[PDB]
Amino acid sequence: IVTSDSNGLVTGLTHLAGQQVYAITEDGATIGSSFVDASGETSVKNVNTTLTVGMQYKPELIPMPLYAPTQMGDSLYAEKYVQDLYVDYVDSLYLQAGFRPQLTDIPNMHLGNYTLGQSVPPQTGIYRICPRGDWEPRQEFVITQSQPGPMTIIGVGYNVEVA
Amino acid sequence: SNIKINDVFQRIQYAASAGQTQFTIPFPFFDNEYVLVWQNGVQLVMGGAPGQYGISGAGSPSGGLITLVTPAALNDIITIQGDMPIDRTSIYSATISNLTGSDLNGDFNREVVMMKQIQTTQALLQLQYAPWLEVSQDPDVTKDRYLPLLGSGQVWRMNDSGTGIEAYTIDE
Amino acid sequence: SNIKINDVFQRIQYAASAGQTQFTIPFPFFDNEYVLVWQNGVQLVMGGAPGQYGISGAGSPSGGLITLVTPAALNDIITIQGDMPIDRTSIYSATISNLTGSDLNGDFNREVVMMKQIQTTQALLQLQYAPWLEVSQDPDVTKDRYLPLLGSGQVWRMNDSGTGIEAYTIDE
Amino acid sequence: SNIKINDVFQRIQYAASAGQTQFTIPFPFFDNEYVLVWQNGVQLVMGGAPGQYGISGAGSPSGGLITLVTPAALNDIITIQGDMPIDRTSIYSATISNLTGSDLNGDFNREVVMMKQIQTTQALLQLQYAPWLEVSQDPDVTKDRYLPLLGSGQVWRMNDSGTGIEAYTIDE
């Protein structure tokens, strides 16, 4: 826990010297990243603010291969295409999901019902995405996070064209 | 819902037919005062008296209409130009501003119109070198760019050394 | 558009080496159709036929590439300029919807690039008085700034009264 | 950043009184380095040594103040102009969960000041045809608009055919 001055300068981070760190406000909003120099100082966006500063560890969730048995058989090796991908989340921020390399960010800000300066609380809901993946039976979809924050994934759904 | 900007210049000029009063404003504008009208090089005044004009369509996404009080003569030249102040006096609060899609659309729309008005002047009314000419790529080299003030009976002439443009008296 | 827009002129010009095909684009661009290429004053076309070029690097901060199909001759002049039409690149719903920083970044970055293209033409390809000259600070005083149309064989010459620039027929 | 941007030209010029040191900046500016000061056509340096100046008021909507170290002589010409770079180096995250009023106002105000600087140059320091003149409304018609490079002792002159402006040598 640190406090920035009127210029956003933060000192006393010697144990993080040379590292890339993120800053999280007390309201629970991640405001960005910066490098700590060799002397333990870094500059953050918010000035005159109490912040938590630390290093990102990136969560990654790759579900099991698509399993959609049909009347023909198990179809474990059949060509499959995912038309829709449902991400089911609780109390989460900064999510992104899809088929690599082009992922889709999951928004967490309601235009028309947001007051500037406030931190939107961790969000709950279902988001539907067209991943635009290939037709391989072992294709991979990824749920991950763009910047540090709360994250809970309660399930992943699909609409699969099973050829 | 967006306004007509792409390939729509903020200036138009017409050759009137005998007895015409209605002239289209083909570009969007936000306020009546931000539209300039000339007739044969003389700027008109909005009003109801003869020689004045009425205006409608402010806030429309596509444009409006200019209605002359006095019917025009054949081959009168009517020029309509958008001239909006480049400023921003409506701003968001630091504490109690609720961000809306209408707010964002409004702010981007007026900045796009401002930018289009600047580019309209640059494209139709100003001079420039052809983009492929071998001008100096350093803006600090002002040989071909900077102009001097012209005194009476003087033209712009590159000097004999080819180092700058200077005013040059030519007798009449 | 989660890139940063650097302060780089939206125009670059090269003198080709013998057989050169690759030329770097130092400024950002977002679409291939919005980058113009000239070779010795003749605009080229994208494609794979001889005399055409390929382009890569759209959406990148910098470091795009132009690859000529036909290798250039020594001292061929290659000009690369950004030309993106002014337009809205977003729409926002009036009802409660979603917003991302990617949406805002795309809108602001593209408007910054559009402004830079206007200012690149102004700085490198246009004439201006030196900023310190004693021009009239009221734009309604058009003595030094309004030009007339030039007829055949005519130049711009300040009149003998020093009240405005008029077209003047040159003689021997 | 939670300030208004007024409609004020981004350039001011003064004729100094005897011994005057303080000159007002009537236009907003966000950083001291983005202001250029000239005294009798010589660019000054910000500092505390004689022949230099100090500047204050960055970020205020009403502009700031220029304080010369050495008092100016009578009728010294002082020119102050804003010169902010056109770029965008601070961007939002992909999925922001906190968008401050200062950040959003900053992005909109910053582009307004950029456009005002471009428009101030073209309104006060550049040439243009009168808005009502019958210039070709197709920008591809470059007869009156494209200039050639001037060689030594040359002027711009519309050719005998009236099809374009060409460089013409005068040795008088």
Added chain:
Amino acid sequence: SNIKINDVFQRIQYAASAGQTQFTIPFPFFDNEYVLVWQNGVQLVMGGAPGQYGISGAGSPSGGLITLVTPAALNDIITIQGDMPIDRTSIYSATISNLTGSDLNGDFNREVVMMKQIQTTQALLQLQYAPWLEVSQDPDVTKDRYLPLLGSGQVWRMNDSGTGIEAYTIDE
């Protein structure tokens, strides 16, 4: 209708401020079509065209709102009056069925509003003798209360016998 009906006249009149658009409806109403609006004696129409109005607040105890599309001029008279047709707004089965207090409230509230509209016209727009005057308490005595139809140029005048009101022609 689980609201309460307050004792408020079913008519309100305003003198508009310069450019006013919003006018409050202090009395309850149930349907938008049952509220009449006049401006300077001319009835308006609901809609979004110029010269029309929008209305909100149906089913609310009070605090409805009339929003003019065209802003009113100074001292324009805006009149708002409730006009709901007298009708049965419910139907009950003879067979054993269900009943709720919402059904009863809707019936009695609408019948109270209908009575208030009748009494509002009687109290604000109609003539009557003062309650304490010595009028005949038998309505079959019509001397003071029954009027004749008026012909051209005629007035109501009690006859010389004091037995009834008759039409009287008035000369020069």
Added chain:
Amino acid sequence: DELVAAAFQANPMYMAASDSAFNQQTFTPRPGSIVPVQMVQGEWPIKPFEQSGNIQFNALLV
């Protein structure tokens, strides 16, 4: 009425979504010629203009 009717009933005319069904400028009326024609435009095919009326009725009263 017969003269008005004959202009679009006796003459060979066509109905379509658009008169762009073929190119009038390059139309080549020659024996054996193939005319490029957009034979279907959206929901509607190009067809002869509908015949209507009772020509014999009019030339029985006249």
Added chain:
Amino acid sequence: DELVAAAFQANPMYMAASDSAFNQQTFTPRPGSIVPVQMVQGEWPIKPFEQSGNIQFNALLV
């Protein structure tokens, strides 16, 4: 109008997606000849140019 009409109603003409349905340069109009023809191009078959109008009506007024 009859002369204009006859040029494309009396003459044998065809409608197709393209005039490349057969090769006009190698077309061999001989008894027993087989002409290579793209009988269907995309969705549209090649067909006779559609007859329209009421020729008799025009030559009853004349």
Added chain:
Amino acid sequence: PIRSISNTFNRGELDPTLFARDDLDIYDKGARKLRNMIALWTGAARIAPGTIYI
């Protein structure tokens, strides 16, 4: 045709040698990768706890 399927994560990360074992009841209850996350005893997967410098 189109089939609708779902996947929860109460069995954690599964070894790649299990990917043909559709007979087991774990095929829709596991993950190919579960990194810097934990499996709650519901089906959900939560980001792993952070650390505080001492």
Added chain:
Amino acid sequence: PIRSISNTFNRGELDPTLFARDDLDIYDKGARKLRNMIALWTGAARIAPGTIYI
């Protein structure tokens, strides 16, 4: 097509992280919210007992 389904409340209020667990036999026996009520052992939900001031 139209499907006819029903739901009882034997398991009370269920945590939101269970809402993808259709494999469990509790999905049609619980409630998203059960506030100021109790679950009888027959599966019905009854309003909670009131209180008497002492």
Added chain:
Amino acid sequence: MIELTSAPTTKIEIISAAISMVGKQQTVNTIDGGGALAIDAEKLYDTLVSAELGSNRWRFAQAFQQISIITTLNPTFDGWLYECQIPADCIMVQYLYPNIQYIVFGDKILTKSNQTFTLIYSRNVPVSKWPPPFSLYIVYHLASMLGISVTNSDRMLARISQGMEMWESRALFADAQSSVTLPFRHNPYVDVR
């Protein structure tokens, strides 16, 4: 006094009726928080209405205005002399008065004369100007697009389609039948005389 119509008079009432048709309760004052149905209805309303009024001569949507010759623009083909600006609110060109030679070419109108020309055209008009049959047709058609975009129900699309086509014909008949049918401008076998 005049009795106010109970038919829809604002675009919000058109939208809320379409949302109710596909089964969701909706009030005009809570349209902002209408979720996916309100998001799509608002986005698709303008495109649907403009397309409809821009592809058919609806009498209630007609308008006229003088057109203007644009200086310095000269066509070089087929004898055309002038390029004329189309009105700003024009959504579908119908014809010119007086009927002389003209064509629509690009976004201009080409003429061979510099006399005063008036254009007859379609335009967007507010809902308060719509005939009630046309309003119900728009409600059905918009609901049909809400079925595709939101409900994803083939059953819903089948149920809405019959009503949508029926009210299109009825709205067209109601608009057309009020006035006489105008004659052709060109009648060659009579004009030649």
Added chain:
Amino acid sequence: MIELTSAPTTKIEIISAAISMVGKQQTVNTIDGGGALAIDAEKLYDTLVSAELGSNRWRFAQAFQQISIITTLNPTFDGWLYECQIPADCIMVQYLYPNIQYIVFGDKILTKSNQTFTLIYSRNVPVSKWPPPFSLYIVYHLASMLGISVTNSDRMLARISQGMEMWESRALFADAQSSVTLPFRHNPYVDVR
């Protein structure tokens, strides 16, 4: 204030509406913010729009340009004498003025004459110049292309395709009816006189 309704004027409005019409709820305020679906939709948009304007005479997409650089064809065939480059912005050659002999051959126009002529052609135009019926037709057509891979139901895709064909006919009619039909330029039984 005034109730305003207007047609799309930007590429983003077309693409975001098309994504709604394939029944996908993910937010597309910008192509950059729209994820993998938006970029694929933009890629197919570029191919579709030019293909559509390049295969039919839309009045709003017509343009003209004088051709003057006409050079000798040597060696040659069929009696052609000169060739000229088809301009790069020409997307479909329609006809030439005046009525000179010519053929489109490769990427050239071959002629037997050397004089300057005018080319009438089709060109790509921005959304701000599109008629509203055309805009809705493109929305459905683009949705039909995306729906090949992402639409769940065959019946739903057929419904989208039906909407594409319906608005194609209405857009074609609205474009065509504004002007008279031009006559054939070749009339042999009359020209022979």
Added chain:
Amino acid sequence: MIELTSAPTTKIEIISAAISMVGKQQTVNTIDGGGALAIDAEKLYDTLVSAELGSNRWRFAQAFQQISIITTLNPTFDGWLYECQIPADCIMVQYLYPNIQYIVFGDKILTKSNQTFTLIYSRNVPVSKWPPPFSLYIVYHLASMLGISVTNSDRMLARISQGMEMWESRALFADAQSSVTLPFRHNPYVDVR
């Protein structure tokens, strides 16, 4: 200034559009790691395009060149005297100028005369020379082959088939309509006179 086309200009952009049509995201600069879809698309592209341009007279794909008599080869049958070499880039022989007696026999052209002959023929041309309608037709046709080779989905093949055949006709019309139809070279009842 010339507006740059947004339609595809390279074979990689054609291929990536076809890959996106069958559902996969694809960038031009990552086409090398495109997996099975990219493997099949690049293998089948050259065969499909060459067969398409080699089976029909497309105006944009036409070319001409003089042919050459080959020494020491004597046809010896039907009165043919010389065997001539077909051009290297020739993909479909169309006709000869001047139109004299000739036949295509084997991979040669047999003639009875030693004058200068010019062959009119089809050839492969780069994508930047393609009309936009033809490009979209190739995208559909290539995507159809990707459905067979990769997706193994009967549903996908059914959905692509309608667009593939529609854009074949539209591309053919757009190519053909720009020029007049040429007359027959042989007219025996007239020539005999």
